[PDB]
């Protein structure tokens, strides 16, 4: 069955609107607390977005401008963070499994830079 991704019991338009707001904050604040899954969903998409931003050219900034809608944040990853990330080939994120919770009873996680 070589397929690949998560449907995360949302549609497909949703799926995107999510990992775009989630990338938006992970970039907006170094780490986030969120479901372990939705995290292992947010890892390689933020990561790839790092590799777009890591480039300088105006293009890369409109390329980012598509997924990450807020200027301040764009500007942050473009100007501030991505450059900082120069000499490192990958692994711009990491994942931590905390524990449970009351209502849903689901495992939980911190995903950080």
């Amino acid at each position: 069955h070589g397929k690949a991704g998560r449907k995360l019991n949302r549609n497909s338009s949703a799926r995107v609107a999510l990992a775009r707001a989630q990338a938006t904050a992970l970039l907006r604040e170094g780490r986030i607390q969120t479901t372990l899954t939705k995290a292992k969903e947010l890892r390689p998409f933020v990561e790839q977005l790092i590799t777009t931003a890591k480039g300088g050219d105006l293009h890369s900034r409109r390329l980012v401008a598509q997924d990450i809608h807020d200027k301040d944040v764009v500007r942050k990853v473009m100007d501030e963070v991505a450059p900082k990330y120069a000499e490192r080939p990958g692994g711009y994120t990491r994942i931590l499994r905390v524990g449970t919770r009351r209502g849903d009873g689901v495992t939980m996680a911190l995903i950080e830079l």
Partner: protein, 127 residues
């Protein structure tokens, strides 16, 4: 002794290691499910296991294990670093019945079971 009345006069009941969650809003069988892991285990163990059992009835159950340990150490002058779960069980409370409407005209008695959760702590030594 002679009379039952005389025994009543003389002795009094002391409850060693025992405490009771009365009238707790949770179904017996559920809560038993947590509690089946506590039983007969190093009482602190029970405090730990009950931090990582992810069921809802973890917490009222733990609450009653501190009560027991409490009552066992204080009220009964026991030995913390050798205290354990001699007994553990739960039985039914007065179950809490209310109506739910259903398809067409029909109705329904839906029962919100209560629980009498109860643990007895004790001293465990081999010789």
């Amino acid at each position: 002794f002679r009379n039952k009345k005389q025994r009543k006069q003389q002795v009094k009941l002391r409850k060693p290691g025992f405490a009771v969650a009365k009238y707790v809003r949770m179904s017996p069988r559920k809560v038993r499910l947590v509690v089946d892991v506590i039983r007969g285990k190093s009482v602190q163990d029970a405090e730990d296991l009950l931090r990582f059992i992810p069921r809802s009835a973890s917490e009222p159950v733990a609450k009653v294990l501190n009560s027991a340990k409490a009552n066992a150490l204080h009220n009964d002058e026991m030995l913390e670093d050798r205290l354990f779960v001699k007994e553990a069980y739960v039985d039914a409370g007065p179950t809490l019945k209310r109506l739910i409407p259903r398809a067409r005209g029909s109705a329904n008695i839906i029962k919100k079971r209560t629980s009498h959760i109860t643990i007895i702590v004790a001293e465990k030594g081999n010789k």
